[PDB]
Amino acid sequence: ATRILLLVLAVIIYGTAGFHFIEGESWTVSLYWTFVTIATVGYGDYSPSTPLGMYFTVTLIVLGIGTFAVAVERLLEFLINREQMKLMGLIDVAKSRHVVICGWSESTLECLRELRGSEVFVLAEDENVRKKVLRSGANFVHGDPTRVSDLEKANVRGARAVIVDLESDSETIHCILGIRKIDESVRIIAEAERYENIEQLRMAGADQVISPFVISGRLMSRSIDDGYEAMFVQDVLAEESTRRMVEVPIPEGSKLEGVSVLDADIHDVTGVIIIGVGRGDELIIDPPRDYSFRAGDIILGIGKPEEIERLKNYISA
Amino acid sequence: ATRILLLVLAVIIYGTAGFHFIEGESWTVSLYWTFVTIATVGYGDYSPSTPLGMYFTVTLIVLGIGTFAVAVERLLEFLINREQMKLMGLIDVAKSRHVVICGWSESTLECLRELRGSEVFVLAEDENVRKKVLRSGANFVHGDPTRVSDLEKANVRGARAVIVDLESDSETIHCILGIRKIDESVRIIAEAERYENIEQLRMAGADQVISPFVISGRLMSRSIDDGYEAMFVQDVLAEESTRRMVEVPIPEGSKLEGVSVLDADIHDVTGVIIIGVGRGDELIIDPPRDYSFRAGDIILGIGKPEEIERLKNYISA
Amino acid sequence: ATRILLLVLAVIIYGTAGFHFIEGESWTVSLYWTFVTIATVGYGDYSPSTPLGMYFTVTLIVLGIGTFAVAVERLLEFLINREQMKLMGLIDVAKSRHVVICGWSESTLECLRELRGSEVFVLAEDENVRKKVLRSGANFVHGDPTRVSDLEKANVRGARAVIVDLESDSETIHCILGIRKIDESVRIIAEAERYENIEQLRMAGADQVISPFVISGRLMSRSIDDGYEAMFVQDVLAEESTRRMVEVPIPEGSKLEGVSVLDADIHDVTGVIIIGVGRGDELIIDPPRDYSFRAGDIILGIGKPEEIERLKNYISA
Amino acid sequence: DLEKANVRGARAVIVDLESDSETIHCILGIRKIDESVRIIAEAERYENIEQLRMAGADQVISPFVISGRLMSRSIDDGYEAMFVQDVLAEESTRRMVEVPIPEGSKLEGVSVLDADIHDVTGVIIIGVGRGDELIIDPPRDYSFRAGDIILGIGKPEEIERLKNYISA
Amino acid sequence: ATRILLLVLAVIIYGTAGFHFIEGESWTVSLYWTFVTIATVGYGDYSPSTPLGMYFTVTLIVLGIGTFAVAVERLLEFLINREQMKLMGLIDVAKSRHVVICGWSESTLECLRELRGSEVFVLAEDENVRKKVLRSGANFVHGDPTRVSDLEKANVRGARAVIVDLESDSETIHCILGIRKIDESVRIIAEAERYENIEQLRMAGADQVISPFVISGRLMSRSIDDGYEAMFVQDVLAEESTRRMVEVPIPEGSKLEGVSVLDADIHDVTGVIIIGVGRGDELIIDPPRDYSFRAGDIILGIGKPEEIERLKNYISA
Ligand SMILES: [C][C][C][C][C]N([C][C][C][C][C])([C][C][C][C][C])[C][C][C][C][C]
Ligand SMILES: [K+]
Ligand SMILES: [K+]
């Protein structure tokens, strides 16, 4: 590790002391000559005429090739070890605004097409998951996501948001309970599977719990006869064929600070069905007529992509 | 990536500015001297006599070894990463007339002995399939063949023909439906397993559907008593012991353009039993007596390998 | 392996004999010139003027690059082979005071947090065990721990203590019987699973047999009604919340050599409940009133971490 | 499926599964069915002992932490392992005993120094527990009541002498 | 592959033509100068004074570093590819007196302790078999031993003897039938499992068929009452505690050529129980009294290791 610098300094001290007391030159001239001889430059302005010195330069050359052959071997061993350990996970995350994805399924592949490639770290343990992650453009960190000692190797303490989606519900509850021991303020998005585990995932400490299987179980049993709400849910939340569910923030100023929903009249001006208003980590669906807008609120509404532009300019000042 | 060139230019500018304003030489002489000193050639025609310059060349030499040690480390990291990613698939196909084989079974191993080695790309996902492909002389591309995003890594848009043979019929139908979304004109050869899936493989968009298990199921149940058609099918299509089923194209000119099958009389002249004629992506088995040959047609017939030569010269002009 | 030195000496003898009999210089001058020319230093003080010698130096240069290209290739082959064999186990242990851990479970992971990282060698055969060991900071040696020929690759003859914890009891008995064939004096700590195998593990040759499942099976069936001994066992042996079970050795001198337990009165002076005394590989739990302490004995007692310090200074001289 | 086994209104539910996460998820379901039943878990890793107590278990027994701390301390000395293996596992000579104090029997209101329990019976008194709270090493300024549980280590010769000393 | 030599010759022709027509030196002087400049020796006896040539040497140096950076990259790619392919099998056997072992079990591990390490090639397909072979000191060749195209990669045509021991009997019969298609004269030693397959293994073409399970099935059912023949079979063929079953060849001369077994009287002279005589690929157990010995015969007998030495000197001349 550091003995290479010791051997280099040893051969420099050997070359200086050998040249100075045999050729009889100055100390700076011997220093310059051994830094030209070790690097195999060979200016040839201060070559030794003495055959004793001519035998000394042979020892200096073989020692210089020896140090060059130990240093290249150490560099190659370090590089091969570092690039074999980096390939199969086995590395510590050094970033500070990354997104950790615990587990790997189809719902985390679809949230990878709206994020960056270098921003995400997938923390899993299986072997084909590594190849799927390296194909999809993420970084793979080998580790058990339920273990607390392997949740810190992905650096969950300095993460932006953590996305938990494991193969069962029990591992999801244990992964949330393991994350909330490390950092109590990080944002956790969890995926439930059974209906009975949503309150368990919320009490474990998740900030947002999504349950897709309950949504499909309710939409399948109400699409046997007619199936009209399934068309709305599909065409708005899944595909976005002609509509889109977007939210808009209210900026500073914003030309509407203080008016009511009766006086704003967003729907008949713009064409956006206003669902609810986001006043500080709560959702008031169908706000009453006397609700006054404020600064920094979030308006949730459904509209065509040409009406969202008509709304975003109506709300800006 | 590109900081290596920046560091190289930085040390060249450092060496030129150091030599020019200390030794007092020309700018071209300093440029030539630092390109001889960095590369460790050392002509020694312009060595510095000044001990300040003699201390400067030590800094130039250590910086040159520093750039040579960062560039070799970057080249070794790039080479080890590229040759570990190339080994286990994980690569993008850059060819433009290749043949993509989705899946791997015995029927695709037998079609690899009549093609080239570098022309084929096997697109599969299992682990022992990679070693069988690397032994048989093909190229292995790791990917799920039903996924559309992994059908483009094998470059199915610029492929010659695609051969689909997966473990079930459902994956064959899904792979054909995934290929026909990308390129609607590429040629697909598919292998059916059950009898009921041949019309499904044709409606999915395959150009040629082969069903070997239906052929064996019909030949097994008609070989219990006597077994005479199984001998013909085996000795003609499988082994080609003494006969062969070949086709011959009609070239331009070709000395028979316009005659009928009664006036050509191919069988009693040559010795080839004429089965059918290939008039443009259709097969007229047992053509009638008034059928007139044209240019570019394909004559399908059974004959000994000494009669195919007697036919191929009868059809050429 | 050693032909590289032969080729190097061959090219040195070729260069010396070529320069001496063409340029007509001394033997030492030719020796110095070929050691400057092979290493590409090039002082240029003895360059050949003769065009025959000028053609000879071309052969010397191409041969020097040839030896440098065979030596670098041999070094790279040796380094890649050694660092691929070292990665997946496959190595022989050279240490002499290490601790060999046969098998891998949760009870050997918890004994790795109180030992060093480089002192332990885990001898197992599975594939994910290698990654868990390389994450936990140990060294992995691939081998079957029941096989005698693979117990010597971990160097069990010169080991400090061996810890046996395998997946069944039969492999534990066979691993103890395999270790006791090699070295009859090494210390073996074994983990039993069933109650009936404790006498079998002791007769096989283990020095200390621990059975955690019997302890849990007794503590579960006595915690249905009240559960008072389980609180003591947990809070003392497992977590050490407020108490600790420690032992203290009696040093030379030690101010209490010869007194009885009635005259020492350790409990009412210090606050440590004295359980037993360790007189030479035996345990006298609840020693009688006439027991006299000696030198080198071991006092086993339960106490708060502020009372162990009051005991350790009461026993020192 | 936990209601098919009738965990509502039982003596105790003893939970030990193939991993820790299923143990936590089983305790979190039993506490949804019955809030007052007694649950005896079994922790595998050391970091999950507080998780089982926060989930709702009344008693957590972690054998692998015990065996992992005992394997690392018996490399040189090995005297704690002899004590636990002779008292808690095999019960060859000594055993741990818990005895209740019956009503009005020779010991209500007397201190521990004039109880003279180590010298007339021979059992080593580890601690006394009252109301699910274990007082290890009770001081001299302590009194016994009717209903306490005395925790001791002794031979079957001395356990019977303690049980006769504790009688009226 | 060979474009490296083309680029090297291109830069040599560029350097010669550049130096000769600018400096005005001879062709040999320019040849010597570019072979000193490309190799970075730098004698400095023929440095260019012209600034046009001083700009030319910069181009020559950058081109020389370019060729050195393409050649080192090609050598490193070749070495990494060759040492990753050699690790996991995937190689062709080039030897000519080796022993191929098809499959891997306990009976082939015990025949590896009486052979060399570099003489054997284990031809199997599993993954842990590779690590067991690399630990036991053999060479691993990845291939399916029933496939004829993978029996030639182990070079079974130029092998000394082939040892077949696979997991079933059907694969043993198919491996013998695959070997006998390639070379009809090679020696095959096969291991049977069931009693009914010994005649099938002999008709398939094996030269020696061993069936250990039939021997154990007969020795188990005759050791219930007394068990006397099992002691003989174990102590003679398995362990060789005090006896040994050896064979001795009769050399040329040999002092006993022509005598009968009555006149030789080997047992009462030496102490070896004579079982049979090996007259040319047949075994005459219990030879009659009139059998005359010849040259090159093989005497099979049981004796103590001090009686085999008394027999081997009685048979030599
Ligand atoms: C620019 C680059 C340069 C390089 C040089 N080298 C030399 C070596 C010597 C040995 C003895 C290489 C050459 C090659 C030719 C072919 C290296 C150096 C290093 C220093 C550190
Ligand atoms: K040089
Ligand atoms: K290198």
UniProtKB/Swiss-Prot annotation, chains A, B, C, E:
Binding of Ca(2+), residues: 165, 191, 193
UniProt topology in membrane: Multi-pass membrane protein
Topology Cytoplasmic: residue spans: 77-87
Motif (Selectivity filter): 40-45
Record-linked InterPro entries: K_chnl_dom, NAD(P)-bd_dom_sf, RCK_C, RCK_C_sf, RCK_N, Trk_Ktr_HKT_K-transport
Annotated transmembrane regions: 2-22, 51-76
Origin organism lineage: Archaea, Methanobacteriati, Methanobacteriota, Methanomada group, Methanobacteria
Highest taxon in the source lineage: Archaea
Entry note about domains: The channel is composed of 4 repeated units, each containing a transmembrane pore part and a gating ring part. The gating ring is composed of eight identical RCK (Regulators of K conductance) domains, in an alternating arrangement of one domain from each of the four subunits and four from the intracellular solution. Two protein interfaces between dimers of RCK domains from the pore-forming subunit and from the intracellular solution hold the ring together. One is called the fixed interface and the other the flexible interface. The flexible interface forms a cleft where calcium binds.
Residue intervals annotated with topology Extracellular: 23-29, 46-50
SUPFAM superfamilies, A to Z: NAD(P)-binding Rossmann-fold domains, TrkA C-terminal domain-like, Voltage-gated potassium channels
This protein's name: Calcium-gated potassium channel MthK
Ranges for domain RCK N-terminal: 96-211
UniProt keywords, alphabetically: Calcium, Cell membrane, Ion channel, Ion transport, Membrane, Metal-binding, Potassium, Potassium transport, Transmembrane, Transmembrane helix, Transport
Tagged with keyword Cell cycle: no
GO annotation, cellular component aspect: plasma membrane
UniProtKB/Swiss-Prot annotation, chain D:
Compartment annotation: Cell membrane
Record-annotated RCK C-terminal domain positions: 84-168
GO biological process, one term: potassium ion transport
GO CC terms of this entry: plasma membrane
Membrane topology: Multi-pass membrane protein
Entry remark concerning the domains of this protein: The channel is composed of 4 repeated units, each containing a transmembrane pore part and a gating ring part. The gating ring is composed of eight identical RCK (Regulators of K conductance) domains, in an alternating arrangement of one domain from each of the four subunits and four from the intracellular solution. Two protein interfaces between dimers of RCK domains from the pore-forming subunit and from the intracellular solution hold the ring together. One is called the fixed interface and the other the flexible interface. The flexible interface forms a cleft where calcium binds.
Subunit annotation: Homotetramer.
Protein's name in the database: Calcium-gated potassium channel MthK
Species, as recorded: Methanothermobacter thermautotrophicus (strain ATCC 29096 / DSM 1053 / JCM 10044 / NBRC 100330 / Delta H) (Methanobacterium thermoautotrophicum)
Gene name of this polypeptide: mthK
